[PDB]
């Protein structure tokens, strides 16, 4: 039949106000005050935000109000705060016992603050190398926004193949989360003096470098 | 959802 | 919350039937029927494909079947077929104000062999610590099915405070990659006996564990 009408957006700003309208029908969103809201960040599970048009579990944010106009409700998101860059989703009673969901909003948070990332650069430690492997990875953390670029270095000459980048997961904030590693073994590991990990990040640039000296 |  | 438990990855091919599984946390459990179960597809809404344990809605082909005993509702697709590929969600009513959520499964379709987890566990830097940070890195390598859960202790007591996990990738051997992390003080690392990083990946089951035998 159909599957309620939201719309792919509500950008609002730090504080500022965003309210998100969720079209349905007579045969739902008309006839039935069972419209559920729920609030999933990327992959996640979904929680119950809104659960009765308006009404939250004792456990949601102080102000996600909620309210119904006719066939369109909505969800006031008022508290602009950023955890919740996120997909929204609407949810009615129609007939016998059937649920229908949303199209899905996707909420965003606009002027947050620039994060340039925090690059911890590791060595094989001990366990790794007793097995005779040594591979070496690249935290790349903490960071706004997500586009970022890792280039390691054997030590000049880049050792950029046996790398596996893997990018970047927003974390328990909305700041990123990247890694990146070189598969070493112990032989390579202990040639060539240093290896470098450099994290370019909206310009600006971060290279670290492990050596073969430490305490393990 | 739960409802009933 | 995530009260209830389910399979990271689940997993078979065009034929092979799956059984999921949302395992409850809850001493309330059995004084319930309410267990419904959420299919959802790649930028898709959730589709309640399950009501109460038993009972498909409309359209959900009686090949998807719910069954619950002692904590563990259950789900069975009763023969994989390609666009099943989804994440699998378990919803309990719990109350009111408190309408709760498994983790999600993901059931995939194998077109390559499976992979278990290669969790190579780091620990704190000696130049790391040289600025009184400590970090420990837990890189999981080399996955397929692309879901897993990563979880974190010390002492035999879980540390679910200090983590991060990233989202498994895909690296130019079409095997999947993820991080994880715990980020914090020298304080926290020295004075404790182990540090061991679980992970568990569809069966398999590897915690790899480090020691603060740290010099300086």
Known sequence: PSALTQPPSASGSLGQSVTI???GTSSDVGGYNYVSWYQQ???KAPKVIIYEVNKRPSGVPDRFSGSKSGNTASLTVSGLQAEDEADYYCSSYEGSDNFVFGTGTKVTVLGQP???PTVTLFPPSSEELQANKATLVC??????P???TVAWKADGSPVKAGVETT?????????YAASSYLSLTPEQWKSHRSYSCQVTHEGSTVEKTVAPTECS | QXHX
């Open chain 1, 21 to 23: 309208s969720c079209t």
């Open chain 1, 41 to 43: 960040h990327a992959g």
């Open chain 1, 114 to 116: 620039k994060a340039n």
């Open chain 1, 139 to 144: 935290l790349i953390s903490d960071f706004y």
């Open chain 1, 146 to 148: 997500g586009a970022v």
């Open chain 1, 167 to 175: 990018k970047p997961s927003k974390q328990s904030n909305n700041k």
